[PDB]
Amino acid sequence: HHHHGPGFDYAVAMAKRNIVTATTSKGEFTMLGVHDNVAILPTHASPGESIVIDGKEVEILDAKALEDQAGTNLEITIITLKRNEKFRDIRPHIPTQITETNDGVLIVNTSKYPNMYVPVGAVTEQGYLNLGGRQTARTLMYNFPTRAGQCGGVITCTGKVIGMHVGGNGSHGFAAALKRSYFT
Numbered sequence: 001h002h003h004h005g006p007g008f009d010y011a012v013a014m015a016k017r018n019i020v021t022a023t024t025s026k027g028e029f030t031m032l033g034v035h036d037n038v039a040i041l042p043t044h045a046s047p048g049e050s051i052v053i054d055g056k057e058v059e060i061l062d063a064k065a066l067e068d069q070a071g072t073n074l075e076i077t078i079i080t081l082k083r084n085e086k087f088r089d090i091r092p093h094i095p096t097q098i099t100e101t102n103d104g105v106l107i108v109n110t111s112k113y114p115n116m117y118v119p120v121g122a123v124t125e126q127g128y129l130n131l132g133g134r135q136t137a138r139t140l141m142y143n144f145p146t147r148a149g150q151c152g153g154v155i156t157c158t159g160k161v162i163g164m165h166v167g168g169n170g171s172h173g174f175a176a177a178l179k180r181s182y183f184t
């Protein structure tokens with residue numbers, strides 16, 4: 001087998017064109033660009049009227065904090081950027097279903113955690129979880145000691161973008177599940 005396996009190669013290829021580092025008033029977050037001018041951040045990143053990407057202020061046209069049908073926070077905020085550059089459309093890589101895997105990779109890219117690729121192993125649906133005081137729905141859980149600064153990180157498996165890191169309790173990490181219908 002190749003030294004660098006399919007999960008890693010997929011993560012790196014996804015990151016190169018669809019992950020940027022965004023700075024809000026709450027600091028730097030890994031940020032997935034989904035299509036056109038649409039990206040996602042952890043809701044607690046609290047994007048304001050603008051964010052910094054690549055040292056430049058980029059206006060935010062809209063920010064939509066996602067909730068499930070019962071009103072429960074999903075901890076995903078969809079933001080729309082005022083700029084002409086379009087993100088490679090990766091919607092086809094986002095599953096229609098909340099998706100588990102035996103082999104997930106957490107992708108983080110900030111000045112604190114530059115080019116971080118971690119195979120977190122099993123990614124399992126958890127559902128409703130109180131994340132340190134923030135009630136959250138549709139979470140995924142992995143057994144890896146994630147830390148502050150990694151939120152916004154992308155969870156992938158080969159061929160799919162399945163979650164966005166939002167929390168952790170010391171020994172485990174938690175992601176907001178991604179579904180294609182969020183972006184269509």
Ligand SMILES: *[C@@H](O)[C@H](C[C@@H]1CCNC1=O)NC(=O)[C@H](CC(C)C)NC(=O)OCc1ccccc1
Pocket residue numbers: 042044075130131132133134146147148149150151152166167168169170173174
């Ligand atoms: C990223 O901003 C950060 C990542 C956490 C920090 C510790 N390890 C991580 O992976 N997310 C949070 O700090 C987060 C923000 C909420 C408003 C969603 N809350 C959090 O992770 O609380 C800790 C906790 C999680 C689950 C059960 C009990 C406590």
